[PDB]
From a paper:
Upon activation by upstream growth factor receptors, RAS undergoes exchange of guanosine 5ʹ diphosphate (GDP) for guanosine triphosphate (GTP) with the help of a guanine nucleotide exchange factor (GEF) such as son of sevenless 1 (SOS1).
To understand what structural transformations that are plausible for [name] in vivo, the first objective of the present study was to investigate if Mg2+-free [name] can exist as a fully open state, P-loop exposing conformer. For X-ray crystallographic- and ELISA studies, we produced [name] KRAS4A (2–169) lacking the initiator methionine (iMet) in magnesium free buffer, with the intention to create a Mg2+-free fully open state [name] conformer. We present a fully open, P-loop exposing conformer of [name] [name] by X-ray crystallography at 1.4–2.4 Å resolution in Mg2+-free phosphate and malonate buffers. The malonate crystals diffracted to 1.4 Å resolution in all directions (isotropic) and the phosphate crystals to 2.0/2.4 Å in best/worst direction (anisotropic). The [name] conformer has the switch-I region displaced in an upright position leaving the catalytic core fully exposed. In this open-state conformation, the P-loop-located region is exposed and should be accessible for binding mAbs, peptides, or small molecules. The main finding in this study is that [name] exists in a fully open state with the switch-I region being fully retracted leaving the P-loop area exposed and druggable.
Residue numbers in the entry:
A (entry chain A), B (entry chain A): 2 to 169
Write the structure that this text describes.
């Protein structure tokens, strides 16, 4: 039932920062007196209960056995790069292709995110990213976790993509 | 083929500290000229290629959709508590029971670890832990990631447990 979001992308692009910001304003204390302590947190986005996972192959998942399992379990993917990191943008295709392979489908809920849009030191232009998103058939959003710009929007977009996919 | 180790336990018991220490002295640069860049890191413990994963339900996996998948993929479990944290010891049974349930088996390679054995502020006695390990049928090891005591031993023990299990 819950929407399973997975944030993917190169290391140091702001996956953790984005997810923490989102959770900060979206967690609810859910009351259930038939469980220990009675109050578990859950994340609710655009009126949907969401589960959230970060696939971090640069850090926490470098020596991991779980990469393909994150991709099989995940329902929608936020593919993140940083606007000051050309390599992180170049890495998007590899992640996208992986997910496509694992899920064995051309149609996966995905949103492309260019993070750190507050930085003056841009090397990835909006148009480059737009072209990429358009090739994939997916939305593109620029975000900044530092300044809190379009963070909720990116997650909201992905939720909506998953909602549309589920209606098929 | 590779040994899939999963470190489980309450938050702040030293799972990350233990795993980082282990990796520090066990990673090898593996040369393979048919791949990009030619040199991927791998972890080798007791002459076995290992993959390493931390299940952290207090942090990185609190809102996660992946708990049961970590347990299904994992082959051996390092169950960690801290000797100054009574609650973290009380939580071991819950983790153990979860893994048993997910894997549908009484026989899972497991090692019980009491971490932070360098601390003077003990509330879990060695005998308590020994009794627990003995009930489970598994080794118990006290460790300190801070002072670097028995860290390799704990992982070596779990590797050996997995080796024995695989020989069945
Ligand atoms: N200027 C700026 N820095 C950011 C932004 N998001 C994250 N960072 C920083 O980038 C680094 C990597 O962030 P982190 O969330 O750890 O990236 P992850 O490795 O992809 O999870 C940290 O220093 C963050 O503070 C952002 O939108 N703008
Ligand atoms: N004294 C002491 N502190 C430790 C030890 N291992 C970890 N810590 C500290 O305990 C805290 C939690 O460690 P961390 O690895 O983040 O725990 P995790 O949440 O289980 O991954 C940090 O402040 C670590 O530095 C240890 O063996 N001894
Ligand atoms: Na790493
Ligand atoms: Na958390």
């Amino acid at each position: 039932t819950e929407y399973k979001l997975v944030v993917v992308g190169a290391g140091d692009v702001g996956k953790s920062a984005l997810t923490i910001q989102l959770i900060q304003n979206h967690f609810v204390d859910e009351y259930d007196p038939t469980i220990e302590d009675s109050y578990r947190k859950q994340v609710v986005i655009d009126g949907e209960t969401c589960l959230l996972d970060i696939l971090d192959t640069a850090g926490q998942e470098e020596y991991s056995a779980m990469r393909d399992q994150y991709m099989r379990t995940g329902e929608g993917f936020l593919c993140v790069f940083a606007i000051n990191n050309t390599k992180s943008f170049e890495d998007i295709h590899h992640y996208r292709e992986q997910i496509k392979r694992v899920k064995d489908s051309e149609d996966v809920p995905m949103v492309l995110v260019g993070n750190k849009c507050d930085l003056p030191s841009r090397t990835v232009d909006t148009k480059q990213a737009q072209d990429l998103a358009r090739s994939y058939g997916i939305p593109f959003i620029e975000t900044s976790a530092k300044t809190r710009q379009r963070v909720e929007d990116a997650f909201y977009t992905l939720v909506r993509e998953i909602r549309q996919y589920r209606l098929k």
